[PDB]
Amino acid sequence: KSAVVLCMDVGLAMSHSNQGKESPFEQAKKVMMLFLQRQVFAESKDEIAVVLYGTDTTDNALAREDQYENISVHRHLMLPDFDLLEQIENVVEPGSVQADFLDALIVSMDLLQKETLGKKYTRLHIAVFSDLSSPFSVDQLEVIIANLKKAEITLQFFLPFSVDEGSGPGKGLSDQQKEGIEMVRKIMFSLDGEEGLSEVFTFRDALERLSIFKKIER
């Protein structure tokens, strides 16, 4: 059994609808719903948590004055069940603010650390869905990375646009998004070198890649 956190950006920028027929928020929610439906119908034993960042309210164990704001734990580390699909397609609404994705990553790591205590897993995994529009602080990032390594948590990033060599003409990414892309690459290379950079995907590939990974003895 895997332990997986779906760490979903629901910030205001995700609502802006200008490619295709669906906003980044709608695309990401659709992927999440399809993934959870597959897991339920297949009676998978993987446990799946859901953390939202960019939510108007705050609900997480680390939240205090000016810390880990606008991050909400929507689903704890449990088996997905039929009843959750309804719960997801009702309490996943777009937020009106932005939040710090490294704060959201820490909340997700803390969730895994507490809720995997005393149990055996094939892997511990965090999958981030975001357009990287929101500012973030790199304070103590080196400790975040150290702890990801120590706990043997792997990371995957899913973005609504390509960033690889075939990405083609420019997509009008903001400087903040370009900074977010660069920091994602630094994090993934810190964790697994060139192979980690390969774990940055688009929304279009997310449903299928969420299941694929390299086995590492724990």
């Binding site: 820490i106 803390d110 975040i144």
Partner: peptide
Amino acid sequence: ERKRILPTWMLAE
């Protein structure tokens, strides 16, 4: 840079 406070378990030696 905005300072964050990490949970104690992340600061353990």
